[PDB]
Amino acid sequence: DQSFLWNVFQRVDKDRSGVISDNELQQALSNGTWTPFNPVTVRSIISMFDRENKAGVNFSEFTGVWKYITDWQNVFRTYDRDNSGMIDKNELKQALSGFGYRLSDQFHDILIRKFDRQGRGQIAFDDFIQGCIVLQRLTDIFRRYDTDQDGWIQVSYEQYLSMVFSIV
Amino acid sequence: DQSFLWNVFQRVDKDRSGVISDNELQQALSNGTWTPFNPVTVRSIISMFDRENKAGVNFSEFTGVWKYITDWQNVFRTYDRDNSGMIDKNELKQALSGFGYRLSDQFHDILIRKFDRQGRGQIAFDDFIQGCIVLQRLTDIFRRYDTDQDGWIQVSYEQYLSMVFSIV
Ligand SMILES: [Mg+2]
Ligand SMILES: [Mg+2]
Ligand SMILES: [Mg+2]
Ligand SMILES: [Mg+2]
Ligand SMILES: [Mg+2]
Ligand SMILES: [Mg+2]
């Protein structure tokens, strides 16, 4: 529904420039905890859909942003079974298993610790997205190196440095 | 010479608070290119000597900062053989070999590309420090994992994720 998305775009694009900036997108997003939507997550989302290195999305690009965030909301709403604004370790295990990840139970505690900005041992919507984006990017890199598909990689000193340099 | 360092500390500590902030240290440092001293390098240096998580150094901690930066200046001044403000690949090879690193010729191009903010294919003083801090930290992690000291490591999927999570 382009007519619906256009009216949304106009309300988010507060400076009426035709480009939604990081700050404009952040102000339009709720993370369900009454704190600012994780600005790293916002930057990740804008960068994924901005095809012009302009630190923002135009209307065509925003239609993708809106579907992306809506799809994420639908996943999170499914697994936040108590409507608390955060999913717990068991719910995170189910959600990531639904994406196809193969992760030990104990690694889910590591993931929550790494990405939960609230510090309560559960994970809110904005931090959930960011953790999943990172997990996909890191797993993609591992899949490239694991050419024998055994779950293990072997790398030299300089291969390891180059691998880290590709990450950060 | 505490009397000399005290007078330096007073001039850098512009707000006269007894704590030199990141911004105060940055304003006191020249990177020899007439651009602001790399703020990542400044943050790395403050964090290394601040024992109190106060985003700054007191006078005792600053005596360490001053010796640290002075030691780095002495290394860089040695190898900037044309007094240009930047060292080239050959000079970088010598400097890092002097620190004990074992790096192929081609990896020095990778290092320069990764850390040279000026974009000229050489490396200035502030970027040199930051690259060396990162190289030490990453090599330290590799040394921990390379228990057979052969220059190769083998890691599982979850070991790799945990390793990356320790880096960034
Ligand atoms: Mg705008
Ligand atoms: Mg919940
Ligand atoms: Mg393998
Ligand atoms: Mg001060
Ligand atoms: Mg030079
Ligand atoms: Mg080994």
Curated annotation (Swiss-Prot), chains A, B:
One of its GO terms (biological process) is positive regulation of endothelial cell migration. One of its GO terms (cellular component) is cytosol. Gene3D superfamilies: EF-hand (1.10.238.10). Coiled coil: none annotated. It holds the Pfam family EF-hand_7. Ca(2+) 1 binds at D13, D15, S17, V19, E24. PROSITE patterns: EF_HAND_1 (PS00018), EF_HAND_2 (PS50222). Keywords: Acetylation, Angiogenesis, Apoptosis, Calcium, Cytoplasm, Cytoplasmic vesicle, Endoplasmic reticulum, Endosome, Magnesium, Membrane, Metal-binding, Nucleus, Repeat. Residues 1-35, 36-66, 67-102, 103-138, 139-168 form the EF-hand domain. Ca(2+) 2 binds at D80, D82, S84, M86, E91. GO terms for molecular function: calcium ion binding; calcium-dependent protein binding; magnesium ion binding; protein dimerization activity; protein heterodimerization activity; protein homodimerization activity; protein-macromolecule adaptor activity; protein-membrane adaptor activity. It is found in: Endoplasmic reticulum membrane; Cytoplasmic vesicle, COPII-coated vesicle membrane; Cytoplasm; Nucleus. It is a peripheral membrane protein. Calcium sensor that plays a key role in processes such as endoplasmic reticulum (ER)-Golgi vesicular transport, endosomal biogenesis or membrane repair. Acts as an adapter that bridges unrelated proteins or stabilizes weak protein-protein complexes in response to calcium: calcium-binding triggers exposure of apolar surface, promoting interaction with different sets of proteins thanks to 3 different hydrophobic pockets, leading to translocation to membranes. Homodimer and heterodimer; heterodimerizes (via the EF-hand 5) with PEF1. Isoform 1 and isoform 2 self-associate; probably forming homodimers. Interacts with CPNE4 (via VWFA domain). Interacts with PDCD6IP; the interaction is calcium-dependent. Interacts with RBM22. Interacts with PLSCR4. Interacts with ANXA7 and TSG101. Interacts with DAPK1. Interacts with SEC31A; the interaction is calcium-dependent and promotes monoubiquitination of SEC31A. Interacts with ANXA11 (via N-terminus); the interaction is calcium-dependent. Interacts with different set of proteins thanks to 3 different hydrophobic pockets. Hydrophobic pockets 1 and 2, which mediate interaction with PDCD6IP, are largely formed by residues from EF-hand 3 (EF3) to 5 (EF5), as well as by Tyr-157 (EF5) of a dimerizing molecule (Pocket 1) and from EF-hand (EF2) to 4 (EF4) (Pocket 2). Hydrophobic pocket 3, which mediates interaction with SEC31A, is mainly formed by residues from EF-hand 1 (EF1) to 3 (EF3). EF-hand 1 (EF1) and 3 (EF3) are the high-affinity calcium-binding sites, while EF-hand 5 (EF5) binds calcium with low-affinity. A one-residue insertion in the EF5-binding loop prevents the glutamyl residue at the C-terminal end of the loop from serving as the canonical bidentate calcium ligand. EF5 acts as a high-affinity magnesium-binding domain instead. Magnesium, may affect dimerization. EF5 may bind either calcium or magnesium depending on the context. This is Programmed cell death protein 6. The gene is Pdcd6.
